[PDB]
């Protein structure tokens, strides 16, 4: 689908909250542990995302952190179309948790283990030895020239 389309969700592990943005066309992920699923935390994560990739549209789970006017304000500022409650990706949250289990014993804190897992996911060749990683795919899809 469009190069500018992201899906945002949340997943919970060890009592902490991980916000995950998936670039729908490529399966590339961005993720971070945050203190809680608040408006101010969600808006900050989105503003960081939109400053790093060209984000036109976000699909959300319509959680209350999304309905907040702080999130709406960020999205307006960044020119992002927020599509709440609009639905390979339900087992993205599952995929990321698995990878986190494989590195968890190399890091003292969960937040570091999440970043390791993001690194592994985005570098992973899919479709066997002849294939491409989510990382290669997102840049091929969004490059304008």
Ligand X SMILES: Cn1ncc(CO)c1-c1ccccc1
Q: Give residues 61-120 in contact with ligand X (rule: CB under 6 A).
A: 61-62, 85, 87
Are 137 and 41 within 8 A, CB to CB?
no
Q: Which does 62 bind (CB under 5 to 8 A by kind): ligand X, a copy of itself, none?
A: ligand X
17 binds a copy of itself (CB under 8 A): no
Mark 22-61 with x for binding to ligand X (rule: CB under 6 A) and - for no binding.
Answer: ---------------------------------------x
d(CA 36, CA 34) in angstroms, rounded, equals 6
CA 11 to CA 144: how far, in whole Å? 33
Dihedral (CA of 117, 1, 131, 91) sign = positive
Reported as half-sphere exposure (CB side, CA atoms, 13 A), residue 45 has a value of 26
Provide the binding-site residues for a copy of itself, judged by CB under 8 A. Answer: 30, 32, 43-44, 47-48, 50-54, 77-78, 106, 111-112, 115-116, 118-123, 132, 135-136, 139-140, 142-145
């Amino acid at each position: 689908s469009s190069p500018g389309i992201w899906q945002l969700d949340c997943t919970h592990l060890e009592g902490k909250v991980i916000l995950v943005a998936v670039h729908v066309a490529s399966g590339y992920i961005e993720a971070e542990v945050i203190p809680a699923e608040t408006g101010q935390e969600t808006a900050y994560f989105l503003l960081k995302l939109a400053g790093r990739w060209p984000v036109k549209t976000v699909h959300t789970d319509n959680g209350s952190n999304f309905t907040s006017t702080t999130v709406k304000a960020a999205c307006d500022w960044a020119g992002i179309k927020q599509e709440d409650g609009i639905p390979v990706i339900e087992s993205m949250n599952k995929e990321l948790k698995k990878i986190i289990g494989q590195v968890r014993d190399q890091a003292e804190h969960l937040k570091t283990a999440v970043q390791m897992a993001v690194f592994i996911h985005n570098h992973k060749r899919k479709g066997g030895i002849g294939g491409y990683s989510a990382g290669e795919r997102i840049v091929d899809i969004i490059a304008t020239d």
